[PDB]
Write a protein that binds this DNA or RNA. Structure first.
Ligand SMILES: [Mg+2]
Ligand SMILES: [Mg+2]
Ligand SMILES: [Mg+2]
Ligand SMILES: [Mg+2]
Ligand SMILES: [Mg+2]
Ligand SMILES: [Mg+2]
Ligand SMILES: [Mg+2]
Ligand SMILES: [Mg+2]
Ligand SMILES: [Mg+2]
Ligand SMILES: [Mg+2]
Ligand SMILES: [Mg+2]
Ligand SMILES: [Mg+2]
Ligand SMILES: [Mg+2]
Ligand SMILES: [Mg+2]
Ligand SMILES: [Mg+2]
Ligand SMILES: [Mg+2]
Ligand SMILES: [Mg+2]
Ligand SMILES: [Mg+2]
Ligand SMILES: [Mg+2]
Ligand SMILES: [Mg+2]
Ligand SMILES: [Mg+2]
Ligand SMILES: [Mg+2]
Ligand SMILES: [Mg+2]
Ligand SMILES: [Mg+2]
Ligand SMILES: [Mg+2]
Ligand SMILES: [Mg+2]
Ligand SMILES: [Mg+2]
Ligand SMILES: [Mg+2]
Ligand SMILES: [Mg+2]
Ligand SMILES: [Mg+2]
Ligand SMILES: [Mg+2]
Lengths: 151, 117, 70
RNA sequence: CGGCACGUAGCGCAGCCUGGUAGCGCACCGUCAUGGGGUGUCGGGGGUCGGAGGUUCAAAUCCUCUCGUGCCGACCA
RNA sequence: AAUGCCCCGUUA
RNA sequence: GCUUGAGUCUCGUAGAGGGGGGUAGAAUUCCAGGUGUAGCGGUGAAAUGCGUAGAGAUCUGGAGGAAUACCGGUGGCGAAGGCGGCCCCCUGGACGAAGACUGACGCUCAGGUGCGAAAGCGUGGGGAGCAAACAGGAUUAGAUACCCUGGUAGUCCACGCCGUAAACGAUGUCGACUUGGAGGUUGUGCCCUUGAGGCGUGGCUUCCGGAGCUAACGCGUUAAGUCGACCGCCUGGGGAGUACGGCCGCAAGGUUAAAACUCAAAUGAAUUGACGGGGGCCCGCACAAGCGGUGGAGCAUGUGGUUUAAUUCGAUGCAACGCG
């Protein structure tokens, strides 16, 4: 906003593991306030991904988020007589949130049967560098590289 | 082909594009690159990054001649005045002289009329 | 504006020197001036405008600093 | 006086070699845009081939005639 | 360093 | 008759003052050649255009035209217009110093005469760049324009014509008087120029401002203040600086210059608001960053339209339409 910057609100970590990252992920995944359903879904999919790919839920989740993590986004500047799609770096919270959002969106788009299965499949694909999430990440990276002529 | 260690880098920076020409001390050209052939057209052509990319490409092209010492002669205004020289230094040519050869007339031919945009 | 890099002279320092020499020479200003023709009347009028601007920036700011603000 | 080439959406033009559709532009209709119009955005209705005859399974589409059209020529005394 | 634009009936 | 106005003489000072002839550097364009290859140019973005017939870039030589960066400065000169590289020839004016000289010879000026930006006209040359007209490509509803690519008269030279400009300081010429301040430029006297200095004394010029004046804005010793001499000009706006006539001009057109008709206002300065695709600061779910929707389907409800005997009346930008 114009006037001032604000203070950040606290988010309670999850009970299963205590990860604020997982808490934010479930808060992004939930809808209409059904946090219980969101927690059930995320926990089921995470346990599935863990027993699939070996290492525990935290390791799988963080490697997937790292493979989906962006570094440079693009913004509009509109300085003077010309408009510019300037690329700008991203901060940690922003890139984590964007990764989570792209992951949940890819899961929603996936035409599997259950949401837990969709999410687990998307997470595995991201860990192995596949899926619409990493696709969009590469697309935005390419766009930033193209518009790299602005600083 | 022959090899030479001392050369000149004629930079022609315009408000729209940027040309880079590596040549021998006798003006005999060896290789050239432009921001319009480096993949940037229109609004990206008149940028310093495109000029530096063009300088890198010209260095890669003239690499065959094995050039070490290089004197730069810059002409005309535009972004491609310092970024291209920086890209040359990065490519690793021993800069020797940095001259300005911008043609400044002494009240000669009159310029065109003003643009009423 | 010809410069020669001295011994152990960093390329960045040579670039700074070149920029400063070109600024002192005023090549870009002359180029921007000669890019488009200026009517003699327009040139004289711009000169007089700059002269009165200088007179203001020399007299009014002094007469204002002579007083206070709070 | 003969002859050549036309007739297609509201309009100006396609479609004629192909016998086995009816297009395009503008315009017209409904919504969005606008303070309200125009400009502009979208989504839509559209004629069914100048008219008769026969050819053919089937004709705007082939011909035979007829309408109205613009044009080309009436010579030599 | 200068991509969109044009218009509002009459009296009071 | 006099020297105080006016002018002449001696010595110097500065100056883009004027005319004529040469000469130098940068830069643009073009021609030839060498290196070299896939773009160059241009725009907000593109295209026309230039390019593989080798462009652009770079280097060498040559041809030619125009103007003279830095000096450069609300600096200088000139009656005005206007004047800008350097050198030379001719030439006008201004100023400063001491004296000498003529002794009212002075000021203004209707007519008249001359000069008079740029554009334009005639003849003969010249022609790089720019560029009316013109062609094409874009923008646009259209674009006979702004923008882009090319480009002819013209811009240049010699001789003549035209005689107009916001030809403005929008302020006629000449002379006298009237508090000041800060400069710039150009002479000159004195003090040790002890230094670029300290004390004055003349010309031109820039800004502010006092009394006074002014409708106000503003002028303000260079007056738009107090006076005098002469001339030019004005008598509401439009019609109209137009018509006819006269003079001038090759022409374009120039100068002098009305009437009928029509309106009851037109106008200048400033003030308070509003607005600005003017500027500066600031805020708002205004934008941005995100979530969820509407517009697509069925249904409820209101509205418009239509129909009906009636389909009661009202609200009907945002601020009416699940509203009374
Ligand atoms: Mg141009
Ligand atoms: Mg109208
Ligand atoms: Mg005297
Ligand atoms: Mg030359
Ligand atoms: Mg050549
Ligand atoms: Mg040459
Ligand atoms: Mg100057
Ligand atoms: Mg003078
Ligand atoms: Mg006597
Ligand atoms: Mg002339
Ligand atoms: Mg002529
Ligand atoms: Mg001629
Ligand atoms: Mg042009
Ligand atoms: Mg045209
Ligand atoms: Mg041209
Ligand atoms: Mg006049
Ligand atoms: Mg006058
Ligand atoms: Mg007189
Ligand atoms: Mg006087
Ligand atoms: Mg007076
Ligand atoms: Mg007065
Ligand atoms: Mg008169
Ligand atoms: Mg009258
Ligand atoms: Mg007349
Ligand atoms: Mg007459
Ligand atoms: Mg007024
Ligand atoms: Mg406003
Ligand atoms: Mg404002
Ligand atoms: Mg938003
Ligand atoms: Mg009702
Ligand atoms: Mg309500």
């Amino acid at each position: 906003p114009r006037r001032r910057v604000i203070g950040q609100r606290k988010i309670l970590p999850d009970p299963k593991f205590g990860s604020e990252l997982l808490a934010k992920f479930v808060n992004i995944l939930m809808v209409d306030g059904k946090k219980s359903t969101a927690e059930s879904i995320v926990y089921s999919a995470l346990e599935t991904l863990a027993q699939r790919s070996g290492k525990s839920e935290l390791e799988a989740f963080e490697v997937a988020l790292e493979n989906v993590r962006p570094t440079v986004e693009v913004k509009s500047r509109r300085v003077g007589g010309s408009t510019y799609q300037v690329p700008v770096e991203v901060r940690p919270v922003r890139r984590n949130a964007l990764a989570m959002r792209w992951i949940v969106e890819a899961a929603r788009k996936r035409g599997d049967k259950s949401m837990a299965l969709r999410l687990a499949n998307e997470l595995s694909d991201a860990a192995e560098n596949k899926g619409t999430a990493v696709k969009k990440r590469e697309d935005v990276h390419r766009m930033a590289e193209a518009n790299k002529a602005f600083a | 082909r022959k090899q030479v260690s001392d050369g000149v880098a004629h930079i022609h920076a315009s408000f729209n594009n940027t040309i880079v020409t590596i040549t021998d001390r006798q003006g005999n050209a060896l290789g050239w690159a432009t921001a319009g052939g480096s993949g940037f057209r229109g609004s990206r052509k008149s940028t310093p990054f495109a000029a530096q990319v063009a300088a890198e490409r010209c260095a890669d092209a003239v690499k065959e001649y094995g050039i070490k010492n290089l004197e730069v002669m810059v002409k005309g205004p535009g972004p491609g005045r310092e970024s291209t020289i920086r890209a040359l230094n990065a490519a690793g040519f021993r800069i020797t002289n940095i001259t300005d050869v911008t043609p400044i007339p002494h009240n000669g031919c009159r310029p065109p009329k003003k643009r009423r945009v | 504006p010809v410069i020669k890099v001295r011994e152990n002279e960093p390329f960045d320092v040579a670039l700074r020197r070149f920029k400063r020499s070109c600024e002192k020479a005023g090549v870009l200003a002359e180029v921007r001036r000669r890019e488009f023709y200026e009517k003699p009347t327009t040139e004289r009028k711009r000169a007089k405008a700059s002269a009165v601007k200088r007179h203001a920036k020399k007299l009014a700011r002094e007469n204002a600093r002579r007083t206070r603000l709070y």
